[PDB]
Design a protein around this ligand. Structure first.
Ligand SMILES: NC(=O)c1ccc[n+]([C@@H]2O[C@H](COP(=O)([O-])OP(=O)(O)OC[C@H]3O[C@@H](n4cnc5c(N)ncnc54)[C@H](O)[C@@H]3O)[C@@H](O)[C@H]2O)c1
Ligand SMILES: NC(=O)c1ccc[n+]([C@@H]2O[C@H](COP(=O)([O-])OP(=O)(O)OC[C@H]3O[C@@H](n4cnc5c(N)ncnc54)[C@H](O)[C@@H]3O)[C@@H](O)[C@H]2O)c1
Ligand SMILES: NC(=O)c1ccc[n+]([C@@H]2O[C@H](COP(=O)([O-])OP(=O)(O)OC[C@H]3O[C@@H](n4cnc5c(N)ncnc54)[C@H](O)[C@@H]3O)[C@@H](O)[C@H]2O)c1
Ligand SMILES: NC(=O)c1ccc[n+]([C@@H]2O[C@H](COP(=O)([O-])OP(=O)(O)OC[C@H]3O[C@@H](n4cnc5c(N)ncnc54)[C@H](O)[C@@H]3O)[C@@H](O)[C@H]2O)c1
Ligand SMILES: Cc1ccn([C@@H](C)c2nnc(Nc3ccn(Cc4c(F)cccc4Cl)n3)s2)n1
Ligand SMILES: Cc1ccn([C@@H](C)c2nnc(Nc3ccn(Cc4c(F)cccc4Cl)n3)s2)n1
Ligand SMILES: Cc1ccn([C@@H](C)c2nnc(Nc3ccn(Cc4c(F)cccc4Cl)n3)s2)n1
Ligand SMILES: Cc1ccn([C@@H](C)c2nnc(Nc3ccn(Cc4c(F)cccc4Cl)n3)s2)n1
Lengths: 268, 268, 268, 268
């Protein structure tokens, strides 16, 4: 068996072994999937990381902001998996926001050029990935994106939060197009995970106050979550992502699935 | 393997072979679960129905409004699966609303004695079942209830919609308690299903106007659903319930999963 | 002038001079309305209290759970305001929940008889009041109920939280009926107010610990609220209720207006 | 008295006498406000229109995408109202989206430069206007933006819908900053209004299919609205906007008020 047995799935956004995408790709492999990986800048460095995965997988360059990479991508992808074969799953684990639009810089001081870049990479990218890949997706297929609940404003995240609100709106439209191909589109809203950017600020990068704000945020999460929340374990969210890649949520699309320990359902 | 291989799961609310509980129980067994069933009032009939299931399973009587059935329940359940064994999953598929509070009788004309019965059975029962069964559930366990999205008012459902609002709220509180035992609690919001009662009313059992109302509702669902909606196929919801009973949504609780074809995400 | 100049408005749920309803009635009178008050059980005491209001007003008995009181109510109101006169506004500020379903008693230990009583008074009452009063309301009118945001579970409120979810759902159905008369129906979701029950529990009543859970809830409100929150000042909510009774939210119905200082929009 | 008596309020986004901003400004003046208007391109043309307003009001140029205009804005505003005077209200009624991101062009075919332009004007501008204006606003003041409900995907609106999700997110962050000055920030989510562009598309300017999409949308709104919805009457949304500019929603911020006839609360 295996939840994802003989499914060909693309996974983007692995940069380190702490990346959420990394564990997705691992659990997918643990579970009988056959992957195709995308990388962004330091591929040789990335390639170095993905070797640590339980199975080998093709690594492709994908700068989401490059139109040519996008146009060429399905071709480049089909070559890697064999003609007369298509993808069954796609995972979008891509995000970025300049420190001017996130962290300690005041909310009003973020220049739209920085914000437009963050939105380009964090929201629009979900459609442009979906536009590129849907022609080579099999009916019954699934696209999963990574969300962080933006329904209420929170202190540090600022413009990333605004970007996530847009991504949520975008997923809904993508589900409309994806429907034509019999493909589902959903976001997983994860609670906070100790990935390097998160790890950097809890470590004290950018000051002690910002790290205590974040720890206050992390503390509140595990508190509110009736089954707790472990910033250090990215596996429960990866299992959730795989569930949406599987055939076990066949009637769910344009939706958001909350992998946060139930934090978002409790006030305190 | 089976998604629920060697999982011990209780399933309530089977009254006919069209009942959602029936397809839940069926898909569960297909996927390696070992079930215990509860039924209300017409036991002889229910047992007769459960024989059509892929495996034999114990049938226990449970009128949720009967306190004795509730107190005895954990005892009676343990007897059925062997001492030193506990439940891994529990499914609440129970709903009821008097015609005075649902269908064609005007909203203002439902007597609270009737409404109180509908809420007792459709919302409160969810807590009283979890109170009875949590002491005999294993950590890692899951409780799933059945929801019908009450976030907006709809024409016929009336007080059942109100009952569902209450159930959603109850699910959130149950999750707090279930968390102590390492148990998740969630609802599946299904789109409309052609169960006997639905087939009855679309057929004209409640008048010409009410049967046209349902078809109008169903057509709209399937239109809005980017992946369509088939009132006659209860399987995608039973798979969804099974996904939550599995170990693949480990970080989700107090929450609602929409198995509605994505209807709720589209305006039109 | 006056925002509510020469509008005839009924106001319920006055029991002390700390009652939100009391400030509603006060600000209403300040704003040129002519009121009719309903009171429950301690009529003589209420009358003693309503004398402290800036204007005289008829006081009518209304135990929402008494069918006789409801049927007689429309008659009794017109009698009090003169035949050929109709109500322009109605205010529902009524709630009740037994301590078995609220406070320190565990969630699972509330007997449905107690919960059913709480729902009867806090949710259903909203409907049975609209049913009584709509026939004698003028087009352009407003029915306002009092809400406490139940979208997430919180520690002490328990079954009152569940009751508020139900009331919300009820408001949506009531708007459908009220629409036929050209009448709006809405809830104000207020933040916590140091009303007598709140005053009792912050006082070491029910333990130091339950009061500390509550103070954490109260503190957090003022923290999260971008304009802060003053538990001792009920005036901002009475103003909000008056805004909905006015002709200045004419296209808003079946909705919830949050007078919480914006707390519900911020995570922390 | 007038709801907005002797309040100094800035109003942007007037381009025609059908513009929502126009009725806002009209009802604001009717209600005792002293306005300051902003215009964007066709200033000479706008002045001709604003002459049709019940009172004269200074017209200032403001291209939201021009930083210089933003920086100069507070100065230019203070000149118009007298030094030592500040604003009590600000209205953001600004939106724009290229036909590539809205209407008949497929969702996947919108170029990010066009999308980025739309979000710039429709979402970011709400922040950049507030940054410019908060220093010269009196405590107790109010900022209102115009929303169109993006919580569910709809056929034509596409990237404008995405922009509004972002704008909602932004409103929440702006209220945190606005709070320091004792100022509220809120959006009014309006149902569809027959402004020239809407009338245009209904006429067939974007094809037969798109004009039928809109009427189908408008028809559904008035059905669902328990109090109906008149696409041709913008006064109820302008009345709503004025209510938020008043001192009658003092405990509401970072929030959204729905002036939609209650459509969003009904399923059908
Ligand atoms: N980190 C968290 O606490 C957490 C929580 C909620 C949601 N998320 C979301 O999950 C995703 C992954 O999170 P993470 O913490 O693992 O982040 P990460 O830092 O590990 O990965 C972010 C990824 O974005 C990719 N990326 C940036 N620009 C790109 C571009 N131009 N083209 C292609 N790829 C590009 C990088 O390759 C990187 O792998 C993000 O989108 C994030 O918004 C993360
Ligand atoms: N079909 C739909 O449109 C739909 C959609 C969403 C959710 N649901 C929900 O699914 C669940 C079952 O729906 P269904 O379509 O299978 O209906 P069904 O009639 O087949 O099952 C309803 C069950 O409730 C049980 N019940 C009634 N009173 C009881 C009592 N006092 N004690 C124990 N059980 C009692 C009945 O025995 C019956 O098995 C309900 O919770 C319903 O609210 C149905
Ligand atoms: N006080 C708060 O912190 C708060 C916050 C949010 C919402 N609310 C809601 O506002 C309303 C009033 O709040 P409050 O704090 O002023 O409470 P309160 O105790 O001062 O008033 C509640 C009222 O309900 C009335 N009541 C109880 N049972 C009744 C029945 N059988 N028939 C008629 N009236 C009955 C009482 O006479 C009393 O006037 C309640 O519905 C409550 O749920 C209160
Ligand atoms: N009309 C509707 O059906 C509808 C519904 C809900 C909300 N809204 C919102 O109401 C607001 C105005 O709507 P409308 O229907 O009056 O539109 P409109 O075309 O009449 O006004 C839009 C205004 O935005 C201004 N504008 C555009 N780009 C600008 C820029 N770069 N800098 C400065 N100003 C700029 C224009 O000058 C124009 O006056 C928009 O924000 C829209 O999102 C419209
Ligand atoms: C949400 C979500 C959670 C983690 N991420 C990844 C994919 C990112 N994308 N852009 C990023 N840039 C920035 C800018 C500033 N910081 C560090 C930072 C912060 F200031 C505030 C909160 C959290 C974090 Cl970590 N990071 S970090 N995204
Ligand atoms: C939700 C959900 C959807 C179907 N159900 C099952 C469990 C029910 N339980 N009580 C019910 N009472 C009533 C009262 C009247 N009717 C028939 C009826 C109706 F008038 C309107 C819509 C559907 C149905 Cl069938 N049914 S229907 N629950
Ligand atoms: C919401 C809302 C906010 C205040 N109320 C009024 C109308 C009420 N009606 N019945 C009530 N019962 C009970 C039962 C126990 N307590 C006191 C109590 C508590 F233990 C925990 C939290 C708050 C409060 Cl006060 N109160 S409190 N309702
Ligand atoms: C929401 C909301 C409602 C009307 N608007 C104004 C302020 C706008 N700003 N940019 C706009 N671009 C576009 C792009 C295409 N169309 C015409 C058009 C359409 F294809 C679909 C629906 C309505 C309209 Cl009119 N208009 S329309 N915004």
């Amino acid at each position: 068996t295996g939840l994802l047995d003989g499914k060909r799935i693309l996974v983007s956004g692995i940069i380190t072994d702490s990346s959420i995408a990394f564990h997705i790709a691992r659990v997918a492999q643990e579970q009988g999937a056959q992957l195709v990986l995308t990388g962004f800048d330091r591929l040789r460095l990335i390639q170095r990381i993905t070797d640590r995965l339980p199975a080998k997988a093709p690594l492709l360059e994908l700068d989401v902001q490059n139109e040519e990479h996008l146009a060429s991508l399905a071709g480049r992808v089909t070559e890697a998996i064999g003609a007369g074969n298509k993808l069954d799953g796609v995972v979008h684990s891509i995000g970025f926001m300049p420190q001017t639009g996130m962290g300690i810089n005041p909310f009003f001081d973020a220049p739209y050029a920085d914000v437009s870049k963050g939105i380009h990479i964090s929201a629009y990218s979900y459609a442009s990935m979906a536009k590129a890949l849907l022609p080579i997706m099999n009916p019954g297929g699934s696209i999963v994106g990574m969300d962080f609940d933006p329904s209420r404003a929170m202190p540090a995240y600022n413009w990333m939060t605004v970007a996530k609100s847009a991504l949520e709106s975008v997923n809904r439209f993508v589900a409309r197009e994806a429907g034509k191909y019999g493909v589902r589109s959903n976001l997983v809203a994860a609670g906070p995970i100790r990935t390097l950017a998160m790890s950097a600020i809890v470590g004290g990068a950018l000051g002690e106050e910002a790290g205590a704000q974040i720890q206050l945020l992390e503390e509140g999460w595990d508190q509110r979550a009736p089954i707790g929340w472990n910033m250090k374990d990215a596996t429960p969210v990866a299992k959730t992502v795989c569930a949406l890649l599987s055939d076990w949520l066949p009637a769910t699309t344009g939706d958001i699935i909350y992998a946060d320990g139930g934090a978002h359902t409790q006030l305190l």
